[PDB]
Design an enzyme around this catalytic site. Structure first.
Site, PDB file in Angstrom:
ATOM      1  N   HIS A  17       0.768  -1.018   0.205  1.00  0.00           N
ATOM      2  CA  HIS A  17       0.088   0.129  -0.108  1.00  0.00           C
ATOM      3  C   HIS A  17       0.888   1.216  -0.110  1.00  0.00           C
ATOM      4  CE1 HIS A  17      -2.700  -3.201   1.730  1.00  0.00           C
ATOM      5  NE2 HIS A  17      -3.575  -2.398   0.913  1.00  0.00           N
TER       6      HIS A  17
ATOM      7  N   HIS B 203      -0.094 -10.324   8.013  1.00  0.00           N
ATOM      8  CA  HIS B 203      -1.028  -9.519   9.192  1.00  0.00           C
ATOM      9  C   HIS B 203      -1.249 -10.490  10.470  1.00  0.00           C
ATOM     10  CE1 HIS B 203      -2.652  -6.215   6.710  1.00  0.00           C
ATOM     11  NE2 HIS B 203      -1.608  -6.248   6.294  1.00  0.00           N
TER      12      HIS B 203
HETATM   13 MN   LIG Z   1      -0.258  -4.867   5.139  1.00  0.00          MN
HETATM   14 MN   LIG Z   2       0.962  -5.855   2.957  1.00  0.00          MN
END
Ligand SMILES: [Mn+2]
Ligand SMILES: [Mn+2]
Ligand SMILES: [Mn+2]
Lengths: 405, 404
Positions: B122, B237
């Site tokens: 991102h 994550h």
């Molecule tokens: Mn991420």
């Molecule tokens: Mn990522």
């Protein structure tokens, strides 16, 4: 010229860092010009910098636009030299709880030349977060953003009080508000200017705003007569026509300066006026204006031709309507504009051995035919494109229209 | 625990500052959690901070997102305390001509705790100048952005060399590259790790899929060099902060996981931590620190058909109407435990406050052998009925059938 009691202030506005970023020829005109300003502040050794608004051309600037600005600020305003100015006014006013102090009163960041600025119409705060671009540079510690106008309805204008030596300076700020509305809040006496009382007389009062000087609409400007008389000098922002020379207003009693923009955001004669910035030196209650011309500004030439009434076209065109010949006659004119465009640059850069850019050429034309004497206007894109490599505005060289509606 | 020869490092990744900024309930979870990270670095008095990427959730962060990040950086990483680290590596290789030096070797800006970060998926660069959000924080003097990958085809990885006392550390960095492409450039041996000598502790941080849904979209641990000692995984994550050892390779691998839940799945349900990484000599010490400002999240999976509690009624009898109350009892027991976890975790200290509205997720595959179909209710309506009890008001439950 300045001594310990003279305050050298550098004035500039409407830099519009971000104008024509995507234009291949003229992409760097936006930030390279701004960087010249910041270098002068360090070069001329001013005590501060005051910006009038529209620092960015876009509300949400690009990463490149924000980078070039951040880059210039850090290089030219950070240093070992001490600031000789004193912050007397209340910090809590127009400095939030993040960093309630001024940037050069900060322990961990050394600011050699502090920068003050208001938000313009393009710079104005927006989004659900309600922050502007100046808040970002301020939390970066690079800039000082005053003259916030929370309520357009009810307006309180409190001053930033600064003093160098025996010279005291009261600084007033008022960022851009929509011209049609701010016109009415003044009429209703909704705005109150706050004053210091103890040394109230000695204060040199300075104001900077960002509105239409004169308007096309009958409600979309701000009349000079509406401002208080105690003020000494005013810097006009939102206007891009360089009128850096301070005219005195009789009724009010103060002088008015209109610095104009840093680059041409529009191809009109007002933007053709050679662009300057001013070394404004304040001593006691008297100011000294030293205007400094900009070198990195792209050469711009504009003319107006009414083909019917013109000295050259009168004969060939009424009788015959010969389009191809219309070119050649017009060709000769554009080439004489480019000729003078290069000469101005040549003359202006004869002075110093710093070492030319492709100039800007604009022609605006109306043609009228009473009885089928019609001038034939070539396709706008085609005529302009033929000067590819001679002008910066390859697509936008000439405008054609008729004045009957 | 640390002396002059032990290097305290704070490790975090995927802060995703900007996630759900426009959500009325959960707008501030994004940055307030990141601020906790920064305050810890100052509180724990670490020697540095190492970010794995995805600092922003958006490629172009909003003005509020950039402000709150900048605010946390200035408050916690600027100070009078000196940095006990020395910069041995070449400044020119990873720092542009704008400011060729490290941010804490800067004369006009006093940096107390230096931040090193790579760009995530991102956070990645985009636009004209090929700049990302980290280039602005770097030119603001708040962050050191290393591990740029100019060419995806040909990759040269040069280390940042840092030393505290008798302890020497080689810091390797690699920014996020597309998972399908980076899988192949490695196979062609296109990437070269530059080396410095002493028994340098070698540390690498990357931002790739650990395991993939696609057969080409991940990076296997078995392709990286063996001389490296520890690896931080930065795109996953799930919080697996506990360093597992890899037998073939010989190094340990940490997977800190995100800072907030960008998705409502059991991987994000795993209690999120950060690690006070203490490096002494060629030995590392890991002190994992749990995050308190993280929203309570509870997720479960219910297969209606096979569920023991109800069987007969739902198959052949009238549906829709009664099913609610049955599901109603279950979701309230999830909200119940969500509140309890928060209470138990925050009982410890006098935060003096009320607790946040939890995140509740149910997933439902419902099978029906022979016209025995359960009658499902409209997604928005069922979720909305817990307005004020959960943070995710409009998306509590997921209904689906597996076969397509
Ligand atoms: Mn991420
Ligand atoms: Mn990522
Ligand atoms: Mn303007």
């Amino acid at each position: 010229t300045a001594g310990p009691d003279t305050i050298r202030i550098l004035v500039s506005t409407d830099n519009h860092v971000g104008y024509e970023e995507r234009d291949p020829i003229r992409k760097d005109d936006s930030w390279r010009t701004f960087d010249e300003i910041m270098q002068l502040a360090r070069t001329k050794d001013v005590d501060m910098v005051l910006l009038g608004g529209d620092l960015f051309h876009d509300n949400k600037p690009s990463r490149k636009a924000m980078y070039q600005v951040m880059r210039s600020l850090r290089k030219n305003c950070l240093g070992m030299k001490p600031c000789e100015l004193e912050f007397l006014s209340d910090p809590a006013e127009v400095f939030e709880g993040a960093f309630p102090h001024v940037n050069y009163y900060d322990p961990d960041i050394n600011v050699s030349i502090p920068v003050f600025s208001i938000h313009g119409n393009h710079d104005d705060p927006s989004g659900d977060g309600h922050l502007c671009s100046l808040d970002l540079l301020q939390v970066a510690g690079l800039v000082n953003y005053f003259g916030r106008v929370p309520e357009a309805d009810n307006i309180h204008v409190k001053p930033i009080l600064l003093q160098k030596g025996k010279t005291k300076l009261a600084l007033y700020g008022m960022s851009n508000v929509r011209d049609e509305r701010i016109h009415r809040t003044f009429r209703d006496n909704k705005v109150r200017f706050y004053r210091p009382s103890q040394q109230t007389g000695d204060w040199f009062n300075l104001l900077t705003l960002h509105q239409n000087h004169y308007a096309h609409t009958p409600t979309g400007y701000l009349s000079e007569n509406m401002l208080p008389d105690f003020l000494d000098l005013v810097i006009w922002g939102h206007e891009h026509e360089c009128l850096i020379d301070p005219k005195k207003n009789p009724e009010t009693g103060f002088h008015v300066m209109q610095p104009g923009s840093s680059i041409a955001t529009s191809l009109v004669p007002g933007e053709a006026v050679p662009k300057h910035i001013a070394i404004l030196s304040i001593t006691g209650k008297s100011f000294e204006v030293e205007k400094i011309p900009l070198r990195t500004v792209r050469p711009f030439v504009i003319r107006e031709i009414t083909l019917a009434t013109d000295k050259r076209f009168k004969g060939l065109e009424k009788k015959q309507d010969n389009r191809q010949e219309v070119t050649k006659r017009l060709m000769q004119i554009v080439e004489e504009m480019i000729a003078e465009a290069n000469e101005m640059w040549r003359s202006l850069h004869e002075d110093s051995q710093d070492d030319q850019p492709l100039p800007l050429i604009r022609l605006k034309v109306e043609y009228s035919s009473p009885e089928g004497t019609k001038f034939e206007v070539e396709n706008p894109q085609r005529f302009s494109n033929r000067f590819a490599g001679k002008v910066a505005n390859q697509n936008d060289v000439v405008h054609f229209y008729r004045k009957k509606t």
